[PDB]
């Protein structure tokens, strides 16, 4: 089966640098692409870059520039993310993701406990079993309707991907997630709350670099 | 490269059987239709039946139904194509064809043909569908443009191909989906039409398109050609 | 919402004329838009469409490669190049408001008034009967029928002498808004039907289906409503 | 390469022949004029991402799952996956006015057809066989294969 794995949480003092590892398996390691988001407590979801495991190009998000190393060990089939001058604002759950949106390959995340403008619209709503959850996600700049994905973030898991494509369900995702959109105002909708509904839901981009997420909106 | 190499020539008695074959190479046998299309010395072009070599399906063409049989050896990768109680009639070269795109209907893909002749002619039924190709002949000069009607007894939207068949050869696919130009087959050849009328449009000739043109059906089955247009050029 | 033709006139065979339709009260930039034209005593045809932006066109088979259909979102102005005039292009030239972006899966609201020009698809629609006669009270009842199945994707439009048709229901059975209780839609599929309830002596009108299922998009043959003797 | 692998997986799948199949023939309406000239590859790409997108949706229901071989599924699942990040990583390395959202909106309304003809046949094996072919004729028309 295809799996995306990660090295345990590690624990730095600052100055120091980390090194975290994604091994996966189940398929031709050097046929995709792996992209490293992190995700501080409490926080959204932020890009740090992407890296071709063919040849070995990496591109990395302005903020990280400087500071991180994307590498890989082909005959491991394993990807490395490498972050130097440790602070305390780098205390956060870092993730390794599979470049097609629509597969939804994720790590289970490494906590590295360290001692366009995407507005998702509201960003916490309390409904009950059986209502109509109408979440919304906003772009500052034009965004292309086959790029706008939305996630099911559980509780210190990885983030379950539900529609690609912004109309489009993944495999497993049920038919009541009706998630519309397209162009700068998107929408995420939900016909018929289920009890184990309640998560907090992200939406992305992945066309133009660098890909962005948006708050994050609180089902409960 | 698709190839289909058919068995060699025959010669029967009348009341003999006569087994065809057709070894496939070149992608998977199982994925593509085989058909068997037979024509006879001076006549057009007939569909005996089909085969899908997945299942086993056989469809024939009444005509045929109860004489001929369309076996297959996947083991081989070779299908077979079997006709019982030979009569005179019967005296013709037979073709295979592989299925197009779809893996069903009649396409570019041909074998090179069988000589079954029975030592000692065409048309269907009555409700199968009419292919009125007109003219039978013409003669035009170095760069005229031949103009070419097929006529359908109902409409069958615009499931039609247009062959060109040189004298000896398998038919080659010049436009499939009565408008749309085969690869490789030079853009001057037209496909226009949509229902019960159909043209195609050979404009600048040029003498290598000197053939025998037909119109085959798929709107419905049996699969029914044209009469056929000899095309040839007038010199001094 | 206003749709103002011109540009139309005497041609002469292979000619070339340009028409133009000035767009007012609504959002020209977020609609797509088409030509529908109408010969002397004829149904409906549909000519052509153009998105929302100006990159997509779509043309009827009867007049590909000869006309070009193009649009200033700035102006807002809908155009139409008539290159190669003939003898069949003699018609009067709608241009209508379609309900999205793109063609297909839509309806023409509003239309123009038209402009004078003087000079096929696989989805055929079957208007029955071609003409009826009732009287004010009566029951009327128009079938259409389609080629293959277009889900609901069918749309019915009113036609009185001399005037621009206009929409009485949209996507088989949706009610536009202003138009009475009286007429209803249905069907799914090939079989579709328009009923007035009680005739009205302003129901007395030419009816047409049209198909939005696929492009060219297609009209019915047309039911002219008559009066009883 | 790429293209001709995913028709290939595509052509194994097929379980019955279309010639059995006749009378459940469709006209889908599929938008070839979204795709423009050999030329203009480059702009089509967000168009040709959501076609790809859209014929793995269309492969990935529950319904597909049941018509057609897991193997066979899985294989044609992995192959649209590397087309999709070809794309995205060419995307990640845009000036059109509408970015071609109408294009997207097109194709979009084309998978919709698919779907509804799919519901109306009860999924029954021809339906499968006509949804098939269609696929494997707009995706070559869509890749210039």
Same mark, same amino acid.
């Not at chain 2, 064809?97 to 039924?125: C, E, M, N």
């Not at chain 2, 019960?196 to 085959?216: K, N, V």
């Not at chain 3, 292979?14 to 009260?25: Q, V």
């Given at each position: 089966?295809?799996?995306?794995?990660?090295?345990?949480?590690?624990?730095?003092?600052?100055?120091?640098?980390?090194?975290?590892?994604?091994?996966?398996?189940?398929?031709?390691?050097?046929?995709?692409?792996?992209?490293?988001?992190?995700?501080?407590?409490?926080?959204?979801?932020?890009?740090?870059?992407?890296?071709?495991?063919?040849?070995? /190009?990496?591109?990395?998000?302005?903020?990280?520039?400087?500071?991180?190393?994307?590498?890989?060990?082909?005959?491991?089939?394993?990807?490395?993310?490498?972050?130097?001058?440790?602070?305390?604002?780098?205390?956060?759950?870092?993730?390794?993701?599979? /470049?097609?949106?629509?597969?939804?390959?994720?790590?289970?995340?490494?906590?590295?406990?360290?001692?366009?403008?995407?507005?998702?619209?509201?960003?916490?709503?309390?409904?009950?079993?059986?209502?109509?959850?109408?979440?919304?996600?906003?772009?500052?700049?034009?965004?292309?309707?086959?790029?706008?994905?939305?996630?099911?973030?559980?509780?210190?898991?990885?983030?379950?991907?539900?529609?690609?494509?912004?109309?489009?369900?993944?495999?497993?995702?049920? /038919?009541?997630?009706?998630?519309?959109?397209?162009?700068? /105002?998107?929408?995420?909708?939900?016909?018929?709350?289920?009890?184990?509904?309640?998560?907090?839901?992200?939406?992305?981009?992945?066309?133009?670099?660098?890909?962005?997420?948006?708050?994050?909106?609180?089902?409960? | 490269?698709?190839?289909?190499?058919?068995?060699?020539?025959?010669?029967?008695?009348?009341?003999?059987?006569?087994?065809?074959?057709?070894?496939?190479?070149?992608?998977?046998?199982?994925?593509? &239709?085989?058909?068997?299309?037979?024509?006879?010395?001076?006549?057009?072009?007939?569909?005996?039946?089909?085969?899908?070599?997945?299942?086993?399906? #056989?469809?024939?063409?009444?005509?045929?139904?109860?004489?001929?049989?369309?076996?297959?050896?996947?083991? #081989?990768?070779?299908?077979?194509?079997?006709?019982?109680?030979?009569?005179?009639?019967?005296?013709?070269?037979?073709?295979?064809?592989?299925?197009?795109?779809?893996?069903?209907?009649?396409? &570019?893909?041909?074998?090179?043909? #069988?000589?079954? #002749?029975?030592?000692?002619?065409?048309?269907?039924?009555?409700?199968?569908?009419?292919?009125?190709?007109?003219?039978?002949?013409?003669?035009?000069?170095?760069? &005229?443009?031949?103009?070419?009607?097929?006529?359908?007894?109902?409409?069958?939207?615009?499931?039609?191909?247009?062959?060109?068949?040189?004298?000896?050869?398998?038919?080659?696919?010049?436009?499939?989906?009565?408008?749309?130009?085969?690869?490789?087959?030079?853009?001057?050849?037209?496909?226009?039409?949509?229902?019960?009328?159909?043209?195609?449009?050979?404009?600048?000739?040029?003498?290598?398109?000197?053939?025998?043109?037909?119109?085959?059906?798929?709107? &419905?089955?049996?699969?029914?050609?044209?009469?056929?247009?000899?095309?040839?050029?007038?010199?001094? | 919402?206003?749709?103002?033709?011109?540009?139309?006139?005497?041609?002469?065979?292979?000619?070339?004329?340009?028409?133009?339709? $000035?767009?007012?009260?609504?959002?020209?930039?977020?609609?797509?838009?088409?030509?529908?034209?109408?010969?002397?005593?004829?149904?409906?045809?549909?000519?052509?469409?153009?998105?929302?932006?100006?990159?997509?066109?779509?043309?009827?088979?009867?007049?590909?490669?000869?006309?070009?259909?193009?649009?200033?979102?700035?102006?807002?102005?809908?155009?139409?190049?008539?290159?190669?005039?003939?003898?069949?292009?003699?018609?009067?030239?709608?241009?209508?408001?379609?309900?999205?972006?793109?063609?297909?899966?839509?309806?023409?609201?509003?239309?123009?008034?038209?402009?004078?020009?003087?000079?096929?698809?696989?989805?055929?629609?079957?208007?029955?009967?071609?003409?009826?006669?009732?009287?004010?009270?009566?029951?009327?009842?128009?079938?259409?029928?389609?080629?293959?199945?277009?889900?609901?994707?069918?749309?019915?439009?009113?036609?009185?002498?001399?005037? $621009?048709?206009?929409?009485?229901?949209?996507?088989?059975?949706?009610?536009?808004?202003?138009?009475?209780?009286?007429?209803?839609?249905?069907?799914?599929?090939?079989?579709?039907?328009?009923?007035?309830?009680?005739?009205?002596?302003?129901?007395?009108?030419?009816?047409?289906?049209?198909?939005?299922?696929?492009?060219?998009?297609?009209?019915?043959?047309?039911?002219?409503?008559?009066?009883?003797? | 390469?790429?293209?001709?692998?995913?028709?290939?997986?595509?052509?194994?799948?097929? @379980?019955?022949?279309?010639?059995?199949?006749?009378?459940?023939?469709?006209?889908?309406?599929?938008?070839?004029?979204?795709?423009?000239?050999?030329?203009?590859?480059?702009?089509?790409?967000?168009?040709?991402?959501?076609?790809?997108?859209?014929?793995?949706?269309?492969?990935?229901?529950?319904?597909?799952?049941?018509?057609?071989?897991?193997?066979?599924?899985?294989?044609?699942?992995?192959?649209?996956?590397?087309?999709?990040?070809?794309?995205?990583?060419?995307?990640?390395?845009?000036?059109?006015?509408?970015?071609?959202?109408?294009?997207?909106?097109?194709?979009?309304?084309?998978?919709?057809?698919?779907?509804?003809?799919?519901?109306?046949?009860?999924?029954?094996?021809?339906?499968?066989?006509?949804?098939?072919?269609?696929?494997? @004729?707009?995706?070559?028309?869509?890749?210039?294969?």
């Amino acid at each position: 089966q295809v799996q995306l794995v990660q090295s345990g949480a590690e624990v730095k003092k600052p100055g120091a640098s980390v090194k975290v590892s994604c091994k996966a398996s189940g398929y031709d390691f050097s046929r995709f692409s792996i992209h490293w988001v992190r995700q501080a407590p409490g926080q959204r979801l932020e890009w740090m870059g992407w890296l071709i495991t063919g040849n070995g /190009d990496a591109k990395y998000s302005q903020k990280f520039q400087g500071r991180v190393t994307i590498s890989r060990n082909i005959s491991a089939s394993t990807a490395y993310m490498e972050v130097t001058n440790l602070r305390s604002e780098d205390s956060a759950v870092y993730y390794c993701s599979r /470049d097609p949106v629509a597969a939804g390959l994720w790590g289970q995340g490494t906590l590295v406990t360290v001692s366009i403008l995407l507005t998702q619209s509201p960003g916490t709503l309390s409904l009950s079993p059986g209502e109509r959850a109408t979440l919304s996600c906003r772009a500052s700049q034009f965004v292309s309707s086959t790029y706008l994905a939305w996630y099911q973030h559980k509780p210190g898991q990885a983030p379950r991907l539900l529609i690609y494509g912004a109309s489009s369900r993944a495999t497993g995702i049920p /038919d009541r997630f009706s998630g519309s959109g397209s162009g700068t /105002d998107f929408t995420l909708t939900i016909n018929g709350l289920e009890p184990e509904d309640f998560a907090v839901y992200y939406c992305q981009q992945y066309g133009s670099s660098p890909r962005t997420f948006g708050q994050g909106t609180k089902v409960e | 490269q698709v190839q289909l190499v058919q068995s060699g020539a025959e010669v029967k008695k009348p009341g003999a059987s006569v087994k065809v074959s057709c070894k496939t190479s070149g992608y998977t046998f199982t994925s593509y &239709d085989i058909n068997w299309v037979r024509q006879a010395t001076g006549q057009g072009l007939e569909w005996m039946g089909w085969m899908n070599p997945n299942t086993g399906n #056989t469809g024939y063409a009444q005509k045929f139904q109860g004489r001929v049989a369309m076996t297959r050896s996947s083991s #081989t990768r070779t299908a077979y194509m079997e006709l019982s109680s030979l009569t005179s009639e019967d005296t013709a070269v037979y073709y295979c064809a592989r299925a197009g795109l779809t893996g069903a209907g009649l396409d &570019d893909y041909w074998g090179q043909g #069988t000589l079954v #002749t029975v030592s000692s002619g065409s048309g269907g039924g009555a409700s199968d569908i009419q292919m009125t190709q007109s003219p039978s002949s013409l003669s035009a000069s170095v760069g &005229d443009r031949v103009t070419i009607t097929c006529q359908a007894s109902q409409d069958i939207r615009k499931y039609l191909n247009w062959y060109q068949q040189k004298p000896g050869k398998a038919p080659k696919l010049l436009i499939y989906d009565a408008s749309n130009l085969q690869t490789g087959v030079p853009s001057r050849f037209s496909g226009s039409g949509s229902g019960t009328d159909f043209t195609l449009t050979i404009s600048r000739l040029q003498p290598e398109d000197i053939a025998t043109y037909y119109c085959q059906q798929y709107g &419905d089955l049996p699969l029914t050609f044209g009469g056929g247009t000899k095309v040839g050029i007038t010199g001094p | 919402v206003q749709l103002v033709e011109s540009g139309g006139g005497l041609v002469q065979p292979g000619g070339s004329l340009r028409l133009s339709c $000035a767009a007012s009260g609504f959002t020209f930039s977020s609609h797509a838009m088409s030509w529908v034209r109408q010969p002397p005593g004829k149904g409906l045809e549909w000519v052509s469409s153009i998105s929302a932006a100006g990159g997509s066109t779509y043309y009827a088979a009867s007049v590909k490669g000869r006309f070009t259909i193009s649009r200033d979102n700035s102006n807002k102005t809908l155009y139409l190049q008539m290159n190669s005039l003939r003898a069949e292009d003699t018609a009067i030239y709608y241009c209508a408001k379609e309900s999205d972006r793109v063609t297909t899966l839509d309806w023409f609201d509003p239309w123009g008034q038209g402009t004078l020009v003087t000079v096929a698809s696989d989805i055929q629609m079957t208007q029955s009967p071609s003409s009826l006669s009732a009287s004010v009270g009566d029951r009327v009842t128009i079938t259409c029928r389609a080629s293959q199945s277009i889900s609901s994707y069918l749309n019915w439009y009113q036609q009185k002498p001399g005037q $621009a048709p206009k929409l009485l229901i949209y996507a088989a059975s949706s009610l536009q808004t202003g138009v009475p209780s009286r007429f209803s839609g249905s069907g799914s599929g090939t079989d579709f039907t328009l009923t007035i309830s009680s005739l009205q002596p302003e129901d007395f009108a030419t009816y047409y289906c049209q198909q939005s299922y696929i492009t060219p998009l297609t009209f019915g043959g047309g039911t002219k409503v008559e009066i009883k003797g | 390469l790429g293209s001709r692998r995913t028709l290939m997986l595509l052509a194994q799948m097929r @379980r019955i022949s279309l010639f059995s199949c006749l009378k459940d023939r469709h006209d889908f309406g599929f938008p070839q004029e979204e795709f423009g000239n050999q030329f203009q590859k480059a702009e089509t790409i967000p168009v040709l991402h959501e076609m790809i997108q859209q014929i793995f949706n269309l492969f990935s229901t529950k319904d597909s799952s049941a018509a057609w071989d897991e193997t066979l599924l899985d294989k044609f699942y992995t192959e649209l996956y590397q087309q999709l990040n070809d794309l995205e990583a060419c995307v990640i390395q845009t000036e059109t006015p509408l970015m071609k959202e109408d294009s997207i909106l097109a194709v979009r309304k084309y998978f919709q057809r698919i779907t509804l003809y799919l519901k109306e046949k009860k999924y029954s094996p021809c339906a499968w066989e006509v949804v098939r072919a269609e696929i494997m @004729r707009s995706f070559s028309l869509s890749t210039n294969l």
